[PDB]
């Protein structure tokens, strides 16, 4: 369904 | 505000009245409006050369880089004409100096097409590419040749020549700094080492220049340096390179950096360990295959072991690294599960450290973004009870990350959705639908919609949690994204049994759903709500009916459907406006004719005595004025201010309408 992934650079 | 307000702005700029442009915005509306050729009032103001119009158009908050149907920008139009003191006002407030159209030409491509003088000086100072040609294949230096004028073409080739010299001075310096990375003098090494890493901290293009100089193999070799100060700065440089695009990440991988970074995860020096975690986290921000290279290097067992670190700061970095790995596909997510991270991640949800709590929620949220068996692995690890408890956290960021994790779990099958329900999440979710935090509102609304898209048992549990009254109440929210997601939730609930569909309508949702559908534009949903029993004549507290909305928004299909279902064609709001008023003001000709066809009052006056002929004659809607006169519009009607429609056409400068009115009188 609503499968959201989140990335983060630093 | 209205489509009447931003009507003559387009021709006031094309004419050139600072005053008329000024009064057209004075009340406040759309600073940049539409056009048949996709133009905006900023484009035509710079084409004709009215400097007093391009400056007033951006001090209120418009957009300097607007595109038409061909991609033309205000800078492209300011260079075709040759107006200098109109170019820099665009360059001052962020304008695409190298903006490309569908033609491929640039402002300096066209500045040399006509051979313009001082306008090339300011675009080159702002970094205008002279080397990039169009799709024809003729550079700006070449278009000045074919024009027959080599005045500023000499300035074009010098800047291009100086650009070639400076790019080769950079490559000369970068190559020598890479050479100094092999120096036996540690002072000379670190001076070069810090310089390269500092350059790599800039944009993605500066990172490529460091890569193109061959710095990566030297930086990887420095990762085994006995000097921990050199080793730390080498880690800092590689981490800066890995913060760029996926191509730069892959170059770090192809340079063989991962085996050294994994080994550095066992370093007792916590500054070096933090930098290695920094570098690995940036590489794991890449695509799935770049995340997999980190996995294939054996980083997972060290990361999971770092989740038991006493150092709470190092623990946040290991969580950051794991969260990026779990942002990949199911193969990458399953590797994190197989490494044993879920038991440690669930245990970390009981940490009193709120920063560790957020970082642990991030990792679980990404793992829960995978397939159903990956979601089930999160459920099997016991995350749901801790997640539900975190919904009562005073920290709104921890609450927002917990809602995100619950939304990802609720995106699986009915068995995973039912697990969320069994953990007692719905009461907290329904209560969060009254949160003043609008971001928490959407997050709780996203979670409920995923639950509502399950079986009839999962839909029934949503109803039993009292969600319908709060969901119906959200249909009147000023945020339209909240209206839409609350509409989607109520639609998923209506897709259950006939009893569940009846409960949505006994909650009074059809009144507000019809209002939403009348504004959006799709008529089949309007037919749906009407067919299901929505009252077409129900007005708001303002007296606005669905027939008012579509006439204001310009939805001809909805206007016709509503009239076919017995909608009051002459319904009045609290101001006395009929749908004919709204359509004659916004300039929708077809809607005006349909209303008049269905018996709309051609001479109806509002509270201040304004007739539809007043609005059409005021706004420059020539065709609507003509149509109104055919249906018997009173040419001599006066509002409360003693203005006839002929007077209003004169006070607005609509001479074509004034000519028709003075002789139809």
Residue numbers in the entry:
A (entry chain B): 1 to 10
B (entry chain A): 7 to 671
What does the paper say about this structure?
To rigidify the construct and exclude potential crystal contacts to the binding interface, we constructed an additional C-terminal DARPin D12 fusion, again using the shared-helix strategy. The second DARPin was placed such that it came into close contact with the first DARPin, thereby creating a ring-like structure, which was further stabilised by a disulfide linker between the N- and C-terminal D12 DARPins (residues 10 and 625). The construct could be readily expressed and purified, and crystals grew after 6 days. They belonged to space group C2221 with one molecule in the asymmetric unit, and initial phases were obtained by molecular replacement using the designed structure as a search model. The first DARPin was hardly visible in the electron density and showed high B-factors, in contrast to the second DARPin, which was fused via a shared interface between the DARPin and the dArmRP. Yet, clear electron density was detected for the disulfide bond, which confirmed the accuracy of our designs. One crystal contact was formed between the shared interface at the dArmRP and a symmetry-related shared helix, but no symmetry-related molecule did make a direct contact to the binding surface. Clear electron density was visible for the bound (KR)5-peptide, which was shifted by one repeat towards the C-terminus of the dArmRP on the repetitive surface. Residues 2–10 of the peptide bound very regularly and nearly identically in every binding pocket. As expected from the design, every second peptide bond of the bound peptide was involved in bidentate hydrogen bonds to the conserved asparagine ladder, which keeps the peptide in an extended conformation. We concluded that the shielded construct exhibits an optimal curvature, since the binding of the (KR)5 peptide to the dArmRP was fully canonical and regular over the whole structure and extremely similar in each repeat.
dArmRPs are currently being developed as modular peptide binders. In these proteins, a varying number of internal repeats, binding the peptide, and capping repeats, which shield the hydrophobic core from the aqueous environment, are stacked together to form a superhelical repeat protein. Designed ankyrin repeat proteins (DARPins) are another class of helical repeat proteins which have been engineered as an alternative binding scaffold. Here we show how we applied rigid shared helix fusions and the well crystallising DARPin D12 to construct a crystallisation scaffold that exhibits ideal peptide binding on a dArmRP binding surface without interfering crystal contacts.
